[PDB]
Amino acid sequence: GMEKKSSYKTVLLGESSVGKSSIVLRLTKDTFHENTNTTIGASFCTYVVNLNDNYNENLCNIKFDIWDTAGQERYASIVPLYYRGATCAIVVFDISNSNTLDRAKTWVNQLKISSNYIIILVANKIDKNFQVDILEVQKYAQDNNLLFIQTSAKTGTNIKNIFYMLAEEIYKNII
Amino acid sequence: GMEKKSSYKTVLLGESSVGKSSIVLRLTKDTFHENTNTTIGASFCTYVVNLNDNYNENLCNIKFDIWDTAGQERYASIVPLYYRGATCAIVVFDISNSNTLDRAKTWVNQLKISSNYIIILVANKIDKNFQVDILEVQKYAQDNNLLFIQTSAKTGTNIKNIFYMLAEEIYKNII
Ligand SMILES: Nc1nc2c(ncn2[C@@H]2O[C@H](COP(=O)(O)OP(=O)(O)O)[C@@H](O)[C@H]2O)c(=O)[nH]1
Ligand SMILES: Nc1nc2c(ncn2[C@@H]2O[C@H](COP(=O)(O)OP(=O)(O)O)[C@@H](O)[C@H]2O)c(=O)[nH]1
Ligand SMILES: [Cl-]
Ligand SMILES: [Cl-]
Ligand SMILES: [Cl-]
Ligand SMILES: [Cl-]
Structure with a gap:
């Protein structure tokens, strides 16, 4: 790629x-x-x-x-339908719930093996007052060569930017 | 299309x-x-x-x-994952079981509404000694502007030809 x-x-x-x-x-x-x-x-x-x-x-x-x-991410026999032929993967966690970070990491590892994805790790709910260490998360994303962004669906912060970053990366690849 | x-x-x-x-x-x-x-x-x-x-x-x-x-065709909330973004749909029935024809017709109707698909209706198991009327089936496919082929997975009859016909149709479209 990239076609x-x-x-x-x-x-x-x-x-x-x-x-x-x-x-x-x-x-x-x-x-x-x-x-x-x-x-x-x-x-x-x-x-x-x-x-x-x-x-x-x-x-x-x-x-x-x-x-x-x-909700289908729970089902190992259904989730591959979501991954297959995907150009991008947006892997989201909640900054106030560390368990959701742990699951996101497991998914990133699965995706890196499955195929070539442009992966963006999304730290959502930043408007709330943190169970995670952002610097550790940023380090994690660098180590795994992921895009990273902090967002709030509530305030609208960086929501469009998720897709701006992805689109920049797709273009870079097509080029 | 077609891209x-x-x-x-x-x-x-x-x-x-x-x-x-x-x-x-x-x-x-x-x-x-x-x-x-x-x-x-x-x-x-x-x-x-x-x-x-x-x-x-x-x-x-x-x-x-x-x-x-x-088996996932049973589940209305799962099957759209199979249809979405598909170029082709291969809708198969068993010539010895008319019930499977009736279901295939229902699926063809759903697909024609869902999106532009190149649809091939496949009459499988022709090696067996018919619950359907082939002429009615051929008429059905014409009326609905489908490709049609009779196959046997058992003998290998027309199996590759399913995809030959589809590929000819994709090319015709790209052109
Ligand atoms: N404070 C805050 N709450 C959010 C944010 N995004 C979602 N929520 C809330 O979190 C809950 C779950 O959201 P939902 O979109 O259903 O999560 P999903 O299960 O991952 O699709 C809902 O109560 C939302 O209002 C956010 O950025 N900030
Ligand atoms: N005689 C005959 N039997 C077939 C043919 N294709 C499949 N079968 C048999 O039909 C049964 C169901 O086949 P399968 O491939 O599992 O159907 P699926 O559920 O639609 O995937 C098996 O016993 C196969 O051996 C065929 O073309 N001719
Ligand atoms: Cl809702
Ligand atoms: Cl909230
Ligand atoms: Cl088997
Ligand atoms: Cl048989």
């Missing part, structure tokens, strides 16, 4: 409650819900980043096809 | 017992098992058709990424 595509399959992965549905809602509808429900059925959405909005107009309109595992 | 791709996601769909795992085994390993087991985990395989083996060498090497639903 240029009409859209880029992107797995949105993380333990329940870390804020995946909230990242999608904030991203796509500029809205946040303090209370959320369990997902009914498969969870998909699309999002377009145009990098010029120095980039080649043909390559730099990047469309994400986001698959939110939304 | 040229490094591989073409292909959903292999049909009621249990119609012969999906057998089509894959015959296709990929030139082998048939008279007895088969329930599938453990997600079921994927790849297959390449080279159309020159009058065609443009760049476009005519067609790689299929085959996702066998392998």
Whole structure:
């Protein structure tokens, strides 16, 4: 790779409650819900980043096809359907719950073996007052050659930037 | 469409017992098992058709990424993972079991609404001595603008031809 595509399959992965549905809602509808429900059925959405909005107009309109595992990450025989053929993996944890970091690390290791993914590790819920050490997390991401970003779905902080960073990386690769 | 791709996601769909795992085994390993087991985990395989083996060498090497639903077609919240982003759908029934035809028709209707698929309706098990009327089935496929083929995983009849027909259709579209 990288072959240029009409859209880029992107797995949105993380333990329940870390804020995946909230990242999608904030991203796509500029809205946040303090209370959320369990997902009914498969969870998909699309999002377009145009990098010029120095980039080649043909390559730099990047469309994400986001698959939110939304609970299916529990099932070892179902989750590969989310990974297969994905260009990007967004692995989310909650800064206030260290257990969710531990699971994210396990997923990063699985993904690195599975295929070549552009992986972004997302520290969500930074608006809250930390069970993790961010510096350790940043070091972790460097050691594993991951993109890293700190976000709040609640305030909107760095939500679009998740996909800006991914799109920059896809372009760099296509180029 | 059609955008040229490094591989073409292909959903292999049909009621249990119609012969999906057998089509894959015959296709990929030139082998048939008279007895088969329930599938453990997600079921994927790849297959390449080279159309020159009058065609443009760049476009005519067609790689299929085959996702066998392998039992998951029962689950309405799981099956969309198989359909989403698929270029082709292979909908298989068993000529000796009309119930499997009725289900295949329901799936064709769902797929036609879901997205633009190249759909091939496969009449498997033709080696057996028919609960269906082939002419009705051929008429059905014409009315719904489907590719149609009669196959035996047991003897190997027309198994490779499923993918020859699909590859011809993908090329026609890319062109
Ligand atoms: N304070 C805060 N709460 C959040 C944030 N993102 C999600 N939540 C809350 O966390 C809970 C779980 O969110 P949800 O989107 O359902 O997580 P998912 O299971 O990973 O999809 C909900 O109560 C959300 O309102 C955030 O960035 N900050
Ligand atoms: N006679 C005959 N038997 C077949 C054929 N294809 C599959 N079978 C048998 O049908 C049964 C179900 O096959 P399988 O591949 O497991 O079907 P699946 O559930 O759709 O994946 C097995 O006993 C196979 O040996 C065929 O073309 N002819
Ligand atoms: Cl909160
Ligand atoms: Cl909700
Ligand atoms: Cl038989
Ligand atoms: Cl088997």
